[PDB]
Amino acid sequence: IQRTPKIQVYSRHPAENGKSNFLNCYVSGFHPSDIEVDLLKNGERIEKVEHSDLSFSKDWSFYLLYYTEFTPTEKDEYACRVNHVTLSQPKIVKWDR
Amino acid sequence: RLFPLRCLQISSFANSSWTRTDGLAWLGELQTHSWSNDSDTVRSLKPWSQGTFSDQQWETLQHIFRVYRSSFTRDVKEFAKMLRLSYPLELQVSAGCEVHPGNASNNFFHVAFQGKDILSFQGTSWEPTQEAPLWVNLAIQVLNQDKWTRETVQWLLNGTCPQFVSGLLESGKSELKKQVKPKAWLSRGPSPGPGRLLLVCHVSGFYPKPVWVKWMRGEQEQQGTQPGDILPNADETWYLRATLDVVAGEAAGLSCRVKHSSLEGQDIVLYWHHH
Amino acid sequence: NQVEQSPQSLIILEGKNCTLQCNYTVSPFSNLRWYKQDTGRGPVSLTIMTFSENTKSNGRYTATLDADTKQSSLHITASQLSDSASYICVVSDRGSTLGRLYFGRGTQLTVWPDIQNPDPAVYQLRDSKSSDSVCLFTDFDSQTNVSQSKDSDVYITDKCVLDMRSMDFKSNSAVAWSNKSDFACANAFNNSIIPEDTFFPS
Amino acid sequence: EADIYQTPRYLVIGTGKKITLECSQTMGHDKMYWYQQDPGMELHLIHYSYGVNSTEKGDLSSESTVSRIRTEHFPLTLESARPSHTSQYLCASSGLRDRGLYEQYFGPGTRLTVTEDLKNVFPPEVAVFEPSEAEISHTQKATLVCLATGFYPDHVELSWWVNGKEVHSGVCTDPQPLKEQPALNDSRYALSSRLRVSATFWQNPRNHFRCQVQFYGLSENDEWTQDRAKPVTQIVSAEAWGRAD
Ligand SMILES: CCCCCCCCCCCCCCCCCCCCCCCCCC(=O)N[C@@H](CO[C@H]1O[C@H](CO)[C@H](O)[C@H](O)[C@H]1O)[C@H](O)[C@H](O)CCCCCCCCCCCCCC
Ligand SMILES: *[C@H]1O[C@H](CO)[C@@H](O[C@@H]2O[C@H](CO)[C@@H](O)[C@H](O)[C@@H]2O)[C@H](O)[C@H]1NC(C)=O
Ligand SMILES: *[C@@H]1O[C@H](CO)[C@@H](O)[C@H](O)[C@H]1NC(C)=O
Ligand SMILES: [Mg+2]
């Protein structure tokens, strides 16, 4: 354990209910590389998720982009869940409108 | 106006029996290659990932990377016995070059252990970093015994890399200087007050990475505007979130300004509140 | 094992050329070494070669290498008696000290004298300061083999070659003795394949 | 080869007792090795080292331990001697040589025999047997035969000395000493050698022939409680003068 993950959750396009979009989670500033990142819909793991190749920045800290295609609605809540050695428990960051 | 090739390696040793080595290559901001632990070869991510290099020349590198991976893994394991280092172990490599205008090119081969620089390849030989622990000396001693490897690293850094990047720079010309225009919208974040408002200017869909975004009242900048990290989209475009925590109310007469190269100085202006 | 040597053992006459083989599956490959090890001694280094080298010499020892077929051989020119040793093939996977050394099993080479004029004869030597012995089977060629004793009280030795350098003359000899006073040199090498025309003393 | 040492060259010790084999080197090579080799068999790596306080285990399993407290010393220890430790033990170093390659340097080796009791240790008796007359009138050559009998362990060096000078010509000694009683576990051994000189050289009364057997046995630190002389490391000789008639 050395560096704690920084998590940022955002959409590709401005969110419009009923209109297809992409949900992005960007986890960064972490070390070591062993990490678990999950995209949640209503608190449950989305299985159809793609991710970029684990990479690192100039300071050697790691970063990952997780993403999925999705259609946002009014009552569907979306989040990103990360477990990592630096965390006492998994960290959830909700997607804000 | 420059495009370094960065070959990046992540290697993880959980115990003496469990490891993985993955890698990737970036030409500037674009990822040109991928290399997973479970793959036989390095993967070409763009149609132009090979540059001007022939199939046989590419295969030569393929075999080199193949031998390098298995040999690295074992050398680290044996170093661990020698230097009495406890698992888990984290090793990273940043290697590559950049071709400069005219003639010159600088190159680099840096390695990190548990997140910190320990040694690099300088000229002909392995050199510890200034603040590396003493055990690093012991590894340098043994690494610097291997004449073939020291020469091979020289050949790759001084010869292969600069030749390669020259072929990539030519072969990806269009994709490298490509322009994609951004799209911007405003929103209202969680209230930091009362009676304070959190204003958010979103910019997404721009390429390439360099960009300028700031909140403004007329022609004056709002010192206090916190720009975010420039965030990756899946389609290799970028996203940004500039915030401003302002009292009231006024302003009101406040404007987010976006400057990109897309987009020939015809800035995207958005006024609060038009969202 | 990732290093195999052929043959396991071989027996040759002096003044002959012979070739010992070595095959390896070791990778990556840095260098291959040949060692001569005389029974009761440490291995002595004959040659070391890297992938870029196809031949190396050290006196009457010539090592060749073919990196494509991961194959080496040691050619011994004009074999002499002192070449009787174990020959060891060893490959290294690192150009540094951090790597493994892979040892072949070893090839045991025996070099016997090519006895030109054989006068095979058993003899009886008197004891210098004690009475009353030793039977000397001598001057046989390298075709004749000496079998050991069945009886516990009879002692038969293996054949041994002496080199009379000045006279340029080599000869095999084997020694039999016993405690029992009845013991006779005529029955000494009875369990061995003696030649027919073998001389006996009186 | 010449810059790596092992003491003692030969070692005999009782079962249960502690054993330490000395390996040293005057060079400053970090990388060092211990091998075990039973006669005829291959070289088994039992320990290796990258420098001081490095003591890694080799390919072959072993109850021996090593210590690397100095660059130049690599002592091997067996805390409790048992008969199965009877073998040859070879020390080695690695460092640069005539080219840009790191090569092995092997020490001379140590021969160890673990016996049940030290009362089993005996020095050789030596006799010289004088040439058969039938040989001299038939071949015109004379063979002198030397016999070393009743020794244990088989830690022996034989040489012929003609007129006070050691000779190698027309000489040969059995590679292996044989067992006098091939059924007993700590059987005594016998060894023979032949020295062959011309009929002329034998018949001269002035000529002196000595068969010498260097026996390796016990030392000052070994305990001895039996009435017979302590079988320490010693030379035993037999001699014969040239005879015309
Ligand atoms: C490098 C830039 C060139 C790239 C050009 C563009 C390519 C296209 C882009 C695709 C890139 C994909 C991402 C891959 C990123 C990985 C970058 C690493 C560069 C590859 C280095 C190649 C080294 C080749 C030498 C090698 O493999 N050595 C091997 C084999 O050598 C053996 O076999 C040889 C013949 O096969 C000889 O016989 C040799 O004497 C013997 O010892 C040797 O074993 C080396 O030690 C391996 C490691 C080398 C780097 C170690 C540096 C860090 C180590 C410090 C760790 C400290 C430990 C703390 C616990
Ligand atoms: C990543 O890739 C490594 C090299 O292929 C894997 O190591 C292999 O593991 C297998 C066991 O099935 C061995 O038989 C083989 O020799 C090699 O050691 C490694 O396991 C793999 N790691 C992950 C994350 O699966
Ligand atoms: C080492 O690796 C993994 C933990 O990542 C574990 O499942 C395995 O059992 C560990 N122990 C071993 C193989 O020694
Ligand atoms: Mg040193």
**Which among D47, D236, D225, D245 is positioned nearest to D149, based on CA atoms?**
D236
* Interstrand relation of B196-206 and B238-247 (parallel, antiparallel or unpaired): antiparallel
Q: Please, how many CA atoms are within 13 Å of residue C138, restricted to the half-sphere of its CB?
A: 29
Decide if C79 contacts C59 (C-beta within 8 A). no
**Which among D212, D223, D218, D213 is positioned nearest to D233, based on CA atoms?**
D218
Decide if D31 contacts D55 (C-beta within 8 A). no
Is C163 in CB contact (< 8 Å) with chain D?
A: yes
CB contact under 8 A, B234 and A54: no
CA distance C24 to C2: 5
Decide if D55 contacts D46 (C-beta within 8 A). no
**Which among B17, B12, B57, B15 is positioned nearest to B36, based on CA atoms?**
B12
**Which among D81, D78, D93 is positioned nearest to D28, based on CA atoms?**
D93
User: In the block, which residue shows the tokens 């302002």?
Assistant: B246
Decide if C33 contacts C87 (C-beta within 8 A). no
Which residues is B243 bridged to in the sheet? B200, B226
The SS3 of residue D200 is helix
* Interstrand relation of D234-241 and D165-167 (parallel, antiparallel or unpaired): unpaired
> Does domain A1-97 bear CATH number 3.20.20.80?
no
**Which among D127, D175, D154, D173 is positioned nearest to D217, based on CA atoms?**
D154
Among candidate residues C113, C144, C170, the one where a domain is terminated: C113
Q: How far apart are the first and last CA of chain C?
A: 57
CA distance C12 to C7: 13
Number of Cβ within 10 Å of residue B36's Cβ equals 16
Among candidate residues B177, B194, B225, the one where a domain is terminated: B177
Same domain, C85 and C164: no
Domain containing residue C59: CATH number: 2.60.40.10
| Owning domain of residue B213 | 178-275
Taking the alpha carbons of B66, B67, B68, B71 in that order, is the dihedral positive or negative?
positive
The SS3 of residue D155 is coil
Decide if A87 contacts A52 (C-beta within 8 A). no
CATH superfamily membership of D117-242: Immunoglobulins (2.60.40.10)
Q: Mutating which of C47, C94, C117, C123 best tests the D interface, going by the most D Cβ atoms within 10 A?
A: C123
Please give the interface size between C and D, counted as residue pairs whose CB atoms are below 8 Å apart: 147
CA distance A32 to A39: 21
Same domain, B168 and B151: yes
Elucidated via: X-ray
Decide if D161 contacts D167 (C-beta within 8 A). yes
Is D103 in CB contact (< 8 Å) with chain B?
A: no
Same domain, C107 and C58: yes
CB contact under 8 A, B142 and C97: yes
Asked if residue C132 has a cis previous peptide bond (ω within 30° of 0), the answer is yes
Taking the alpha carbons of D150, D156, D161, D167 in that order, is the dihedral positive or negative?
positive
B168 CB near ligand 1 (under 6 Å):
no
Binding positions of B for a D-galactosylceramide are 75, 146-149
Same domain, C89 and C2: yes
Domain ranges of chain D: 1-116, 117-242
Identify residue B148 by its one-letter amino acid code: W
Same domain, C25 and C109: yes
Is B10 in CB contact (< 8 Å) with chain A?
A: yes
CA distance B84 to C36: 36
Instruction: State the ligand closest to the CA atom of B135.
Output: 1
Instruction: Note whether D1-116 and D117-242 share their fold.
Output: yes
Decide if D202 contacts D131 (C-beta within 8 A). yes
The SS3 of residue A82 is strand
| Owning domain of residue C183 | 114-202
CATH number of D1-116: 2.60.40.10
Asked if residue D231 has a cis previous peptide bond (ω within 30° of 0), the answer is no
CA distance D146 to C69: 51
Decide if A44 contacts A1 (C-beta within 8 A). no
Q: Which helix (H) or strand (E) holds D245?
A: none
Same domain, C75 and C132: no
Distances (CA, A) of C119 to B191, B261, C134, D141, D196: 117, 105, 19, 12, 15
CA distance D51 to C172: 49
Instruction: State the ligand closest to the CA atom of B21.
Output: 2
Same domain, C106 and C138: no
Ligand 3 closest atom vs CA B18? 2
CA distance D225 to chain C (A): 31
CA triple B214-B219-B222, angle to 5 deg: 40
* DSSP class of D30: -
Same domain, C78 and C147: no
Report resolution in angstroms.
2.5
**Number of domains making up chain C:** 2
Same domain, C80 and C6: yes
- As a three-state string, the secondary structure of C173-198 is EEEEEECCCCCCCCCCCCCCCCCCCC
The SS3 of residue D85 is helix
Q: Which residues of D touch C31 (CB under 8 A)?
A: 101
- As a three-state string, the secondary structure of chain B is CCCCEEEEEEEEEEECCEEEEEEEEEECCEEEEEECCCCCCCEECCCCCCCCCCHHHHHHHHHHHHHHHHHHHHHHHHHHHHCCCCCCEEEEEEEEEEECCCCCEEEEEEEEECCEEEEEEECCEEEECCCCCCHHHHHHHHHCCCHHHHHHHHHHHHHHHHHHHHHHHHHCHHHHCCCECCEEEEEECCCCCCCEEEEEEEEEEEECCCCEEEEEECCEECCCCECCCCEECCCCCEEEEEEEEEECCCCCCCEEEEECCCCCCCCEEEECCCC
Q: Where are the beta strands (DSSP E) in D79-199?
A: 87-96, 102-106, 110-115, 125-130, 141-151, 156-162, 165-167, 171-173, 178-179, 189-198
**Number of domains making up chain B:** 2
Same domain, B120 and B57: yes
Among candidate residues C72, C94, C113, the one where a domain is terminated: C113
Domain containing residue B207: CATH number: 2.60.40.10
Same domain, B21 and B79: yes
Residue D226 dihedral angles phi and psi, to the nearest 5°: -95, 150
